[PDB]
Structures are given as structure tokens and as C-alpha cells.
Ligand binder design. Structure first.
Ligand SMILES: Nc1ncnc2c1ncn2[C@@H]1O[C@H](COP(=O)(O)OP(=O)(O)OP(O)(O)=S)[C@@H](O)[C@H]1O
Ligand SMILES: [Mg+2]
Lengths: 37, 160, 134, 350
């Protein structure tokens, strides 16, 4: 059913949002770390 | 159409065609598909319920004289660069053949006046300077010009 | 003139390049046709009664008329189910789904009872297109 | 001529014996443009050129055709001019705004080093034996126009400046483009009224072609289909009315060169009575509304004979020249009279 698929998508989105609750700067430095040399 | 009388009249007229498909053999889709084009044709008319040769030329000349300002007349007819005389000159210019001023053309003019196609403006006693107006719809004049093989749009100053 | 035809071809190619597509698709043509047509344009269209824009209203009307006319060669609930199936690529939350259901119910009712483009035939009434909509 | 390969000559001769050589030659010009038979016919006829003559060494009769193209916007006149620019072995392209009287002609200047009077050739002088193209001729200043008539009529320029009097050859074929005043051609007016040019300038021109815009759904379909097909064909990644296959561009160029440099037709079988009666009728119907028109028709027949590579002119060339000249003449008249002209001259147009 459409509702089940949408609820699964919402759960995945919430899990990914909890994953990205980590500070964005942590990756930005990493980005810059590839540009420094 | 919100008129109760008119809508009831339409229903009375169109019911026999409504009831044919079931007689031929509660099928809503079948009835609607069978009946839609007839309803459209009926809705085409909600509230509604062969001239002689020279008469056509007279009519088109009158239309041109009425709807074309005089200043441009020569611009459309003189080979090098409303009153009755203007109509006569325009008619003489349009027709490729030499037409003699027989009384029959005047009889045609008067008959057209009687048929309420051309309206007389001036006094009835003044039959030396008469004025006329043309009351023909543009679609009618285009159709008659098509039946004559004449392109009136090329001469209408307003359209140009 | 032919210059506008060349402009239309150029616009379709520009749409194709925007989407990084190696081939041109008719969707780009349909998109550019509006832009070539519009000419005189207001600053902003007024809202239509929660409010919805005039362009979205026309889009929904066009979609529903096209589907009904295609199926001609339906039911209210079935048509709503089809619409929600077609718009699944945009909805991402339950709230958006219930909002879309509200909007489509309101639009279908409004077309049925105000614009007369949709005609009811006798909880799941049959819907037909007014035969004079193009 | 010496550089020509004998294979080129044999191919040209094999083409000449074809009964439909004219049709394929006309269809071979502007493949990318749809329709417009009359304009390409006239331009090809001018391109092949006539035979210049000097009867007695007392007066010189030009063997050149000057073409004027008046068009409503959207008819690809510039495309035709560009194609003519590319095809010609010798060609110069000029625009209306950037062409001054001094620029077009040779002018006297003091040399920066030695400081003696010297002549610098203009566009027309370098167009000698070639072709000159004028774009937006309606933008010409009248003062700049004045110098044009001498070169148009005599194909020679006399420069009398700074104590130096010189004569220079100006035998060139001139193709001019023009747009009607107001941007739209009015069929209810004379050709003179629609174009902001004096009568002598038009008189110097031999062929006049007016192009209008009509809303015809079937012609619109044909135009759209041909345009989109041409667009598909000429993609860099991917890189007729007469029903005849167009000739290759190189083959056409070689044919043009050989015809220009070999054929010299003779008008020994022309019936003077027919042309005299036609010219009397032309006088009648022109005063009702000249000799150089006769001269233009004569050189037109000569060019048409050169197209078929015939040392002598057959009367069919005369008939076709009469037909196209009459078409050009009636195209320049008002609508109220062109119907009568067509009725009167239905014998020749059929
Ligand atoms: N009959 C036609 N067939 C094919 N392509 C055409 C035709 N008419 C116009 N076009 C296209 O339209 C383009 C632009 O036309 P133009 O040459 O600018 O118009 P125009 O008739 O020369 O009027 P001007 O000089 O520009 S105001 C051309 O390059 C062609 O690609
Ligand atoms: Mg152009």
C-alpha cells in the first residue's frame, strides 16, 4: 500500500536526519583537508 | 437557459430521442454515449427554434459605399494616381462588362429597398438626391462575394 | 514567422542542455510552448479559495480532464486514487498526503458545482466531462 | 579554362544534352530554402549573364542583369544573398549602413610615404567581372545613390578629382535587397510608392521581385516540415517543386565557369513582328496605368541560351524570357489592374 511505503520512507528520512544531527563542520574541514595540499 | 418554460419546452422536445436506446435494447453510460452528440447539436441553437445577377453587384457596391470612406474611393477604383451617383460609379467600375442604364436596374434598386436590405434616408419626395444605408451582415456579403468570385476584403479600407 | 520556429527549437535544446540529456524530449517542447505563448504577464496571480494558485488550479483541471477523456476511449474514489498514485513522486510526509487529499476533494467539488466542467451521474457518483471543454 | 580537367568538360557536355537541365539547375540553388521559384529563377538567370555588346563602338549595350529584391521580413533574403556570396568565384558583400559613396567607388588619396595622388579601388571596382551584393539598399543616402547610376548604366566610372581624370571598368552584376517602408508591402499601392527609391534607380534594374507573406496552412505545414528536416540533417553530431535532383555544388560551379567562358549565342531566328506587337501592347497598358526593357529581355534570352550551351538561340528561350519578364512586370502593379493584365496576357503566361 502507498501508506506503508510512505511510512517506511519517513522512517528512513528520520534515521538519516538523526545521522546528520552531527555537526556539519566535521565534514567541512574534511572537504578543506582535501584542498589544503 | 434558466427560464422554466424554455427548459421544459426543450425537455419535451428532446425526450423522445432520450428514450430510444432503451427501446432499441438503467444503462447510464450507454444512454449518455448514445445521447451526447444530439444534446450538443440541440445546444447549438438555444433561443433560435438566390438573388439575381446584377442584384449581387448592387448589394456589394452598396456595402462598399457604406463602409468605405469617400476619400479612399479613387484609391481603390481610379486606375491612375452615400449618394446615388457614387453607387453608380462604383458599380460601373466593378463590373467588367458594360452595363446599359436600363430601367430594370432602377427597378432592382427599388425592390432591394422594399426588401429591407437597403434603407432610404432622405425624404421620399426628394428622388433626385436620395441617400441609402446598407444593413447586411459581413458574413452574408462575404458569402455572396464568394458565390460571385469576388474578393471584397481586398477593397475594405478598414481591414487594410 | 519561421524565426519563432527556430526560437522554439533553440528553447527546446536549452531545456535539454539544462537537464544534461543527450536527446531532446517532448516535455521540453511543452514547457517552452507556454513561455512563448504568455507574452503579457502580471506580477503575481491572486489566490483562489487555505489558498491555492491559479496556475496549480489550471494544472489540476488539465490533468483530470485529460485522464477522464483518455479513459473515455469513471468513479470519484478511483480517480482520486489514481491522482494520489501519480503524485506519489512529490509527497514526502503524511501531512502532505492529507493536504493533497483535501485539495483534490475541494477542487473536484468546485469543478462539479461551480465551473460546470464536471457533471455528476447517479457514495461514489459517476463523473463525466462537459462535452464542450477542449 | 586551361586548368579545367577534361572529365569536367565531358560531365558538363553530358549534362547539357539533358532535356531537364534547366529544371535541375534551378532546383540546385538554395536547397535549404523551400519554395520561391521565381526568385531563384531570376537570380540564376542574372548569374549566368548575357553577352555585352558594342554596336559600332559608338554606344555600348550592357550584357549585365541588375536584380532588385523587395521583401517582407521573414523571407530569408539575407540567406539568398549569402548563398550567392559563397557560390560566386568572385564576390564582395556589403551592408547598407557601412557603405559610403567613397567606400563603394575608387577614391584619390595622398600616399603616406611618397605623397603623390593615388587611386584606391572601391567595392564596385573590385567587383569588375564579378558580382556585387547590396543589403538594405533602401537605407542608401540619396547623395550616395547619385554615383550609382553612372556605373549601372555604363559599367564604367570616371573619377575627376585632385587634377586626376581616370576611367575604370565597372562590368559587374548587382543584386540589391530592400524592405518596404513601414515593414509591410501594400498591394493597393504601386511598386514605386512602397519602396523609397527614385524612378531612375528602378529603371536601371532589369528584374524586380517582390515577396509577400500569406497565411496558408498547407504552405505553413510544408515550410515547418522542411525547416525541421533541414535542422535534423545539419546537426554537427549528425555531420522539390520541380521533382528534379539538385546538382553538386562543385559541378554547378564548373558548369557556370564553362558556360561563361565558352558560349556566345546569336539571335538570328527572332520574329520581330511578335515582339513589336507585344511592345506596342506594353506601351498601351503602361500609359493606361521602354527600350531598355527590350534590351533586358534580349540579354535574358541570351543568358537562357547560354544555360543550354547552344551557339544559336531557339525561340523557346525568347518565350521563357517573355513569360518571366511579364510576371515581373505584373508583380509591380496594383491589385485592381493585375487581374486585367493577366486576362489580357493569358496567351503568354499559359
Ligand atoms: N522560406 C523559408 N524557408 C526556410 N527557412 C526560412 C524561410 N524564411 C525564413 N527562414 C529562416 O529564417 C531565418 C531568418 O530569416 P531572415 O533572413 O532574417 O529574414 P529576412 O526575410 O531576410 O528579413 P530581414 O532582412 O531579416 S528584416 C533564416 O536564416 C532561415 O533559417
Ligand atoms: Mg535578411
Amino acid at each position: 500500500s502507498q501508506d506503508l511505503l510512505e511510512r517506511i520512507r519517513a522512517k528512513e528520512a528520520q534515521k538519516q536526519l538523526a545521522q546528520m544531527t552531527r555537526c556539519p563542520e566535521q565534514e567541512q574541514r574534511l572537504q578543506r583537508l582535501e584542498r589544503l595540499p | 437557459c434558466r427560464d422554466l418554460k424554455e427548459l421544459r419546452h426543450l425537455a419535451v422536445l428532446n425526450f423522445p430521442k432520450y428514450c430510444e436506446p432503451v427501446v432499441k435494447g438503467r444503462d447510464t453510460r450507454k444512454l449518455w454515449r448514445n445521447i451526447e452528440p444530439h444534446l450538443k447539436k440541440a445546444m447549438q441553437t438555444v433561443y433560435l427554434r438566390e438573388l439575381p445577377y446584377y442584384s449581387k453587384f448592387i448589394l456589394i457596391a452598396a456595402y462598399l459605399a457604406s463602409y468605405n470612406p469617400a476619400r479612399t474611393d479613387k484609391r481603390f477604383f481610379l486606375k491612375h494616381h452615400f449618394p446615388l451617383d457614387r453607387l453608380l460609379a462604383i458599380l460601373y467600375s466593378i463590373v467588367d462588362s458594360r452595363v446599359a442604364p436600363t430601367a430594370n436596374i432602377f427597378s432592382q434598386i427599388t425592390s432591394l429597398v422594399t426588401l429591407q436590405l437597403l434603407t432610404l434616408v432622405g425624404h421620399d419626395d426628394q428622388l433626385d438626391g436620395p441617400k441609402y444605408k446598407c444593413t447586411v451582415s459581413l458574413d452574408f456579403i462575404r458569402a455572396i462575394a464568394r458565390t460571385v468570385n469576388f474578393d471584397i476584403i481586398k477593397y475594405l479600407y478598414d481591414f487594410l | 514567422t519561421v524565426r519563432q520556429l527556430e526560437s522554439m527549437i533553440r528553447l527546446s535544446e536549452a531545456m535539454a542542455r539544462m537537464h544534461c540529456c543527450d536527446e531532446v524530449q517532448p516535455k521540453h517542447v511543452k514547457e517552452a510552448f507556454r513561455l512563448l505563448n504568455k507574452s503579457i504577464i502580471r506580477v503575481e496571480t491572486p489566490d483562489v479559495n487555505l489558498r491555492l494558485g491559479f496556475s496549480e488550479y489550471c494544472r489540476i483541471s488539465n490533468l483530470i480532464v485529460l485522464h477522464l477523456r483518455k479513459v473515455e476511449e469513471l468513479k470519484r474514489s478511483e480517480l482520486v486514487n489514481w491522482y494520489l498514485k501519480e503524485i506519489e513522486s512529490e509527497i514526502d510526509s503524511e501531512e502532505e498526503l492529507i493536504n493533497k487529499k483535501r485539495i483534490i476533494e475541494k477542487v473536484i467539488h468546485r469543478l462539479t458545482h461551480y465551473d460546470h466542467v464536471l457533471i455528476e451521474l447517479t457514495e461514489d457518483p459517476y463523473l463525466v466531462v462537459n462535452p464542450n471543454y477542449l | 579554362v586551361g586548368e579545367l580537367t577534361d572529365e569536367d568538360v565531358k560531365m558538363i557536355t553530358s549534362l547539357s544534352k539533358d532535356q531537364q537541365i534547366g529544371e535541375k539547375i534551378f532546383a540546385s540553388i538554395a536547397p535549404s530554402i523551400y519554395g520561391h521559384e521565381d526568385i531563384k529563377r531570376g537570380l540564376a538567370l542574372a548569374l549566368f549573364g548575357g553577352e555585352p555588346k558594342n554596336p559600332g563602338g559608338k554606344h555600348k549595350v550592357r550584357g549585365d542583369i541588375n536584380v532588385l529584391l523587395c521583401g517582407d521580413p521573414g523571407t530569408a533574403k539575407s540567406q539568398f544573398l549569402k548563398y550567392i556570396e559563397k557560390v560566386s568565384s568572385r564576390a564582395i558583400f556589403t551592408t547598407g549602413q557601412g557603405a559610403s559613396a567613397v567606400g563603394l567607388t575608387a577614391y584619390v588619396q595622398r600616399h603616406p610615404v611618397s605623397r603623390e595622388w593615388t587611386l584606391e579601388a572601391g567595392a564596385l571596382v573590385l567587383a569588375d567581372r564579378g558580382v556585387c551584393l547590396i543589403d538594405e539598399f533602401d537605407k542608401m543616402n540619396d547623395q550616395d545613390r547619385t554615383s550609382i547610376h553612372e556605373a549601372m548604366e555604363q559599367q564604367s566610372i570616371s573619377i575627376s578629382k585632385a587634377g586626376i581624370v581616370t576611367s575604370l571598368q565597372a562590368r559587374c552584376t548587382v543584386i540589391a535587397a530592400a524592405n518596404p517602408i513601414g515593414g509591410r508591402y501594400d498591394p493597393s499601392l504601386t511598386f514605386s510608392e512602397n519602396v523609397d527609391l527614385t524612378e531612375p534607380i528602378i529603371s536601371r534594374f532589369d528584374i524586380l521581385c517582390v515577396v509577400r507573406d500569406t497565411v496558408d496552412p498547407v504552405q505553413d505545414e510544408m515550410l515547418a516540415r522542411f525547416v525541421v528536416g533541414s535542422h535534423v540533417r545539419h546537426h554537427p553530431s549528425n555531420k522539390n517543386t520541380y521533382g528534379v535532383e539538385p546538382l553538386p555544388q562543385e559541378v554547378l560551379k564548373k558548369y557556370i565557369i564553362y558556360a561563361k567562358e565558352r558560349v556566345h549565342p546569336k539571335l538570328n531566328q527572332m520574329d520581330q513582328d511578335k515582339v513589336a506587337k507585344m511592345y506596342s501592347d506594353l506601351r498601351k497598358e503602361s500609359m493606361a496605368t521602354t527600350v531598355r526593357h527590350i534590351e533586358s529581355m534580349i540579354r535574358m534570352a541570351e543568358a537562357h541560351a547560354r544555360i543550354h550551351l547552344r551557339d544559336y538561340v531557339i525561340e523557346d528561350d525568347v518565350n521563357m524570357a517573355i513569360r518571366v519578364m511579364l510576371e515581373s512586370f505584373i508583380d509591380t502593379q496594383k491589385f485592381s489592374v493585375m487581374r486585367s493584365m493577366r486576362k489580357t496576357f493569358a496567351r503568354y503566361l499559359s
